């Protein structure tokens, strides 16, 4: 059915429908698909779903000139720990990704691979089964008691990365980025958000290190910036973006309760702008808004009202993608896109509306999503959400 | 005469005219007199002007419940270097300050002493004459070529402070703060703005140190925060505020051209909020706006449009005084004071309008200022600017 109480607004008269260039890509509008893990990849080997993934992305690529950021993709086995999320390290994986990228390009849209390392959010038992470590920045603070216990039970205690192991992850980020471009992707997004490994280094709750990778703002940002620099060198700044969630609490990050949190993220933004002014500007910075501090809470819940991401704009002068509870709030989007370098990521409602962009332009009702199938090994709740026309035929304008 | 093309707005219907408590003081409105050096203090001994200073402050205290921050006052001879700016270290000085504070209190207004250390902005020849060093954070970067040359000519080269000398300044800040309170002041403002010594430590252009007082965000902020902590301990957080100018370029500070500048100031704000949450909240933070990056340029000149101070509000949760080209822009003030913890400092037009607060409430014309007498050893351009009524009697409503 359609979302019951929603009052749509046509946004076609706003900058959401003005073209913009991101990296090498001429986008025709500024509604971006942010990275959305869907758990349809198949075990063993973290293989993109051979039955449905092409169709899923094809559907969501249907509006010409749409920027799509893929579901998070693990850069290596050690970076993973979820059996049904895909990787980008193996030939068997890239065969499937190639088909996906080709399909998106056939629809005249674009695709950026999000590169992921899980750190403490991984399942320590899956990792132990596969002979892999359970990694984080530190070894004396844990995501939650359950994760700490799963780790101990698996004889796979949380491990504070050595410098050599950080270097190994950086090598894997580089090779994953290369693999992505070679298979036909338009670029990559470095995931440094939502409490995964890089965010675990950025955040002083999760990073109690006393070496050069913790204990100060500069040190906590070191790993993220080393990945940025390694990928810029490998595939070019125009093919690299970075995702950050300054106010996020998901996966036991600090959020606004940490009084140094804005400084930590302002420092990262400043270092990106420094690189930009020196000739290597990232394609974009992608921010999760304080509107959504945890993306598994219903829209309107977990909103942090004590901070804004606007500070980033005083520092970083390139494109900014903002995501978090914008589908249900065209009135907010209307104001945000008045800034001419702002794009809007629409997550959950892109799950349920393959033709979301048309609906935003034209002020059409939105399909309700079904959170129960966000993660599921099924075509149902993945490729069977209808377009607006299909929904009319099903009688949804009267259900 | 009145400012010719100005279109006043009555601001009495805004929060500018709602009472607010700052430290121990119940202000009746939120128009603050920011610190304004006037150079009427007499040599030798940096003595507040025995003829005119009481009258100057009395005039500007006339609206009941006004917060006045004094002209900058040197904490010690070594902290000074301008013969006609006052100090707060000697009995002879405090005799005069006592009269000033009494007069302000008789008008039912309040007075906060701004505590100043000049660093590289001092005149090295005055300092050499008096057997004093020419100090800054570093010794290999200079304010400008003229200052570097004056220093060499005076055989008083710019000197990078030792840790012991920093500790000595902190002792002097403490004693100056005590002197101020004992003489009757309501509080003190730590000057960490406008390119004076503390700002010289904060800014990476002027601070190339490699000890614990430079080389990182935390290190560059160390001196400012040590002064904050020393004064909070000495006279209480409710009697201490801090002034910062993130985007200032006056006295060869970096401003927005330094991509790490927001991070540097976000860190300071965060550390203040941390202290506040731990039970010691400063009375206020005072910000110079990017509206005025150099206060000796005519209003509208030297505006930096590439940054905002709004970030501070995501971090620091106490009162914020904002200053910079607000007198000529009631339309901007009207929007800013919608935030209920925002006060507005009015500098240059408080020089020329002793009854500025009435004029803001009632939407009256403003007396033009005469910049030539901003710094002058005279009552003229100091205590002879008329109130609105006096100006009407002089025929200014038709001049
Ligand atoms: C099912 C689901 C999967 C997600 N997967 C990812 C992901 O792989 N990488 C990522 O950075 N964010 C991920 N997110 C966060 C979203 O990209 C987005 O920031 C968030 O859902 C808020 O936007 P929205 O309110 O428009 O959904 C996910 C969110 C959901 C609900
Ligand atoms: C003549 C003059 C003297 C000033 N003296 C000081 C001072 O002693 N301490 C300080 O922090 N700022 C000082 N300032 C800066 C002002 O406090 C204020 O930030 C600036 O003038 C911008 O506000 P305005 O546009 O309302 O004048 C001075 C400015 C002027 C023009
Ligand atoms: C498996 C992933 C790559 C994660 C899924 C859920 C969220 C919120 C991410 O940021 C990544
Ligand atoms: C002599 C002083 C205390 C200075 C005068 C001019 C400015 C802009 C200050 O900040 C302090
Ligand atoms: Cl799993
Ligand atoms: Cl903005
Ligand atoms: Cl002088
Ligand atoms: Cl604000
Ligand atoms: Na099927
Ligand atoms: Na789950
Ligand atoms: Na006289
Ligand atoms: Na002068």
């Amino acid at each position: 059915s359609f979302v019951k109480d929603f009052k749509p607004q046509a946004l076609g008269d706003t900058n959401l429908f003005k073209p913009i260039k991101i990296g090498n890509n001429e986008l025709l509008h500024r509604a971006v698909i942010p990275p959305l893990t869907r758990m349809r990849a198949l075990h063993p080997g973290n293989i993109p779903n051979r039955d449905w993934a092409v169709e899923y992305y094809t559907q969501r690529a249907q509006r010409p000139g749409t920027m799509i950021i893929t579901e998070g993709a693990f850069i290596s086995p050690q970076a993973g720990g979820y059996d049904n999320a895909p990787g980008v390290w193996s030939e068997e994986q890239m065969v499937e990704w190639t088909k996906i990228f080709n399909a998106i390009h056939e629809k005249k849209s674009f695709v950026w691979v999000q590169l992921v390392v899980l750190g403490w959010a991984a399942f320590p038992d899956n990792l132990a089964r596969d002979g892999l470590r359970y990694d984080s920045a530190s070894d004396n603070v844990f995501m939650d008691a359950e994760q700490e216990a799963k780790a101990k039970k698996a004889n796979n205690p949380q491990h504070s990365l050595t410098k050599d192991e950080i270097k190994q992850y950086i090598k894997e980020y580089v090779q994953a980025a290369k693999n992505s471009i070679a298979a036909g992707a338009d670029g990559v997004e470095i995931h440094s958000a939502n409490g995964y490994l890089l965010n675990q280094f950025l955040d002083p709750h999760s990073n109690t290190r006393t070496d050069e990778y913790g204990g100060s703002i500069e040190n906590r940002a070191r790993f993220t910036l080393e990945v940025v620099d390694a990928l810029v060198e490998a595939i070019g700044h125009e093919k690299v973006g970075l995702r950050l969630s300054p106010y996020g609490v998901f996966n036991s990050m600090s959020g606004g309760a940490e009084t140094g949190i804005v400084a930590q993220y302002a420092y990262v933004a400043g270092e990106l702008e420094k690189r930009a002014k020196a000739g290597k500007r990232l394609a974009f910075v992608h921010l999760v808004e304080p509107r959504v501090t945890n993306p598994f809470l219903t829209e309107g819940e977990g909103e942090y009202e004590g901070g804004s991401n606007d500070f980033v704009y005083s520092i970083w002068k390139g494109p900014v993608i903002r995501a978090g509870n914008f589908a249900l709030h065209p009135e907010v989007v209307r104001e945000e896109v008045k800034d001419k370098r702002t794009l809007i990521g629409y997550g959950r409602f892109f799950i349920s509306n393959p033709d979301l962009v048309d609906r935003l332009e034209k002020g059409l009702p939105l399909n309700k999503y079904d959170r129960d199938t966000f993660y599921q090994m099924s075509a149902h709740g993945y490729i069977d959400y209808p377009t607006y026309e299909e929904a009319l035929k099903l009688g949804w304008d009267k259900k």
Side-chain angles (χ1 to χ4, degrees), chain A residues 346-391:
Chain A
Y346 291 96
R348 283 165 284 181
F349 281 95
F350 239 127
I351 292 180
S352 57
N353 296 267
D355 61 335
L356 183 59
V357 182
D358 286 344
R359 299 191 196 216
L360 294 170
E361 185 188 357
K362 303 172 193 180
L364 305 177
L366 303 182
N367 296 351
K368 184 179 184 299
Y369 63 72
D370 174 19
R371 66 177 184 163
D372 291 348
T373 50
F374 279 179
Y375 289 2
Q376 196 88 215
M377 185 54 64
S378 64
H380 179 54
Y382 187 54
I383 54 168
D384 66 348
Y385 282 105
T387 61
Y388 179 63
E389 305 263 342
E390 292 168 346

Side-chain angles (χ1 to χ4, degrees), chain A residues 119-140:
Chain A
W120 76 9
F123 293 148
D125 55 340
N126 284 346
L127 292 163
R129 175 199 68 201
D130 297 338
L132 301 168
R133 301 186 312 259
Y134 178 45
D135 287 338
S136 193
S138 306
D139 59 11
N140 67 339

Side-chain angles (χ1 to χ4, degrees), chain A residues 56-75:
Chain A
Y56 171 74
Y57 283 107
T58 296
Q59 286 178 357
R60 284 157 187 74
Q62 64 181 260
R63 179 84 184 218
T66 304
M67 178 181 180
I68 302 180
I69 303 166
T70 68
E71 68 206 275
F74 300 144
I75 63 177

